[PDB]
């Protein structure tokens, strides 16, 4: 449920993960810096603390709390309570992260008010919430 | 919208399509033989004539009637109006077909009485409802 | 050893094969039309009739003569007797074909005078010399 | 020419890299532990300090020098002075690392005399030796 990869000062390219999704709970992806700030989170919520099939993007500093939430239409959660393999890739952009899933671009996310790269840790977290089918991680990836 | 490949008689192997899904309408996969009998159709109904996110399997002779329709679950229909990229593979068994989507098995279809392989056609058909994102086909593939 | 797919008239798109190579012999890719003219053959000679690791492109009418033979370089022929997995794709241009192996372009073949697309057959043929590892074909693929 | 990924205590699974090979020089892959020992190196030598198209596997402790060298037949170096995309995956086995390339297994390598996992850093190094076509890294990967 927790694993991660730790990379050389990544000021370009993209990280990516492949996982089997879960019917409940959520699957978050963390993009830390050296200060251990959160340059970005990608929180896909399958069935979480009240909401289904919701995608959240945010960023905080280590010590302070969260910023304005981003919910973008386009994340391929399955309907019907199903589960499938999802590919998510995060591109390290010039003016921001660019997120896509299963090869289809979800959204551009400009770097938060003084929180630019490099990314140095990339982290997958699954948090269960009573899931009949738990998430399964297949792969973590840095691209150059 | 309508595309196919003609193989050499396959009795062993598998077939694969890759496409971006539509928000409405349906996407059908026809496995024919010589006589243009449907050994199996895989009808992914995203929104079609009053069904949402419905997987239909079945078979009919060339100019015959449909058999009883199998309705499996586990098909990565995106929630909430979305479109994603789908990967679908059918393994041509010695028993029946084995259906998969995104590296995940959905169901076993024992061939219908009188409709064994050889398969010689693999067909893609998309049929529009009122979809704002029509499906676009990517790849058609035989596996040996 | 010998396998193919029949497409709908492709004038736009690409075709793909994936195979494990042999140590000796050759592997040819034929792009036919209706009249069974060779719009293009891609003849990878691993050891064939006194050529080692030789890439031959060419075209002939159905019951006609070969044209002048193009001999490109850059084809991932394994060294030292080895077998590997090859990925070959041909893009059906508006100019000619674009040849690729393992995500890498090898050459541009402007269609031969009188042999434009539509392509309707994509054929794989392996011909043994004295190879201790015969080639085994994996996938045949049209791209749209 | 140098990049690497740093992983959670990997006692199973496999690491992998995708690169564009170089016409000369060599491309080494390092599997370190926490002591910064070398659990394994995978040195593919395209054109190195006297030899062509040679594959070397070894392991040392941090302070002492190398062990017995392993050269396994099967690495897909290109002939002819060419370059192509190579996929190498290293599986973290029960009794050893298991190496394959382009989906074809090269060899089992049992853990060196008291040098078992976990792996914690995975590292790509290209060292040039007058190369007309330098290696290009595409991706580093941990598999679970
Ligand atoms: Cl027909
Ligand atoms: Cl014919």
């Amino acid at each position: 449920p927790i694993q991660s990869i730790k990379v050389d000062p990544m000021k370009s390219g993209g990280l990516g993960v492949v996982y089997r999704s879960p019917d409940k709970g959520r699957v978050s992806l963390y993009l830390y810096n050296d200060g251990e700030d959160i340059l970005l989170v990608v929180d896909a919520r399958f069935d979480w603390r009240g909401e289904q099939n919701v995608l959240v993007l945010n960023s905080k500093f280590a010590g302070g709390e969260w910023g304005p939430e981003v919910r973008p239409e386009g994340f391929p959660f399955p309907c019907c309570g199903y589960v499938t393999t999802i590919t998510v890739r995060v591109e390290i952009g010039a003016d921001g992260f660019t997120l896509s899933a299963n090869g289809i671009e979800i959204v551009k996310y400009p770097y938060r008010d003084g929180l630019p790269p490099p990314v140095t840790k990339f982290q997958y977290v699954f948090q269960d919430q009573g899931a009949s089918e738990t998430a399964q991680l297949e792969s973590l990836s840095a691209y150059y």
Side-chain angles (χ1 to χ4, degrees), chain A residues 21-25 47 81-83 126 128-136:
Chain A
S21 55
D23 54 339
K24 310 214 193 55
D47 203 15
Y82 297 158
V83 288
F126 167 68
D128 177 82
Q129 183 163 135
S132 315
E133 289 275 41
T134 57
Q136 268 141 234

Side-chain angles (χ1 to χ4, degrees), chain A residues 19-80:
Chain A
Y19 67 82
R20 187 183 270 197
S21 55
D23 54 339
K24 310 214 193 55
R26 62 147 177 210
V27 154
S28 321
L29 308 166
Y30 292 96
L31 277 79
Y32 305 98
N33 69 6
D34 216 329
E36 272 192 339
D37 294 332
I38 296 215
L39 297 159
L40 179 65
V41 56
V42 180
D43 202 309
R45 286 154 172 169
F46 295 89
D47 203 15
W48 203 219
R49 282 179 27 174
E51 335 166 68
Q52 295 71 253
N53 306 337
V54 134
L55 177 61
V56 183
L57 306 202
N58 221 319
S59 330
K60 78 185 173 214
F61 285 98
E65 94 241 305
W66 288 115
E69 258 193 45
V70 155
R71 278 134 185 268
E73 287 217 328
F75 191 88
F77 306 87
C79 68
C80 318

Side-chain angles (χ1 to χ4, degrees), chain A residues 106-143:
Chain A
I106 317 319
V107 102
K108 341 147 193 286
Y109 184 101
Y111 298 117
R112 280 278 139 91
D113 334 61
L115 271 176
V119 202
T120 84
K121 185 155 70 203
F122 177 42
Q123 194 190 23
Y124 160 83
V125 174
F126 167 68
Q127 321 216 306
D128 177 82
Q129 183 163 135
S132 315
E133 289 275 41
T134 57
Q136 268 141 234
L137 181 53
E138 292 188 27
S139 84
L140 292 159
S141 283
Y143 304 90

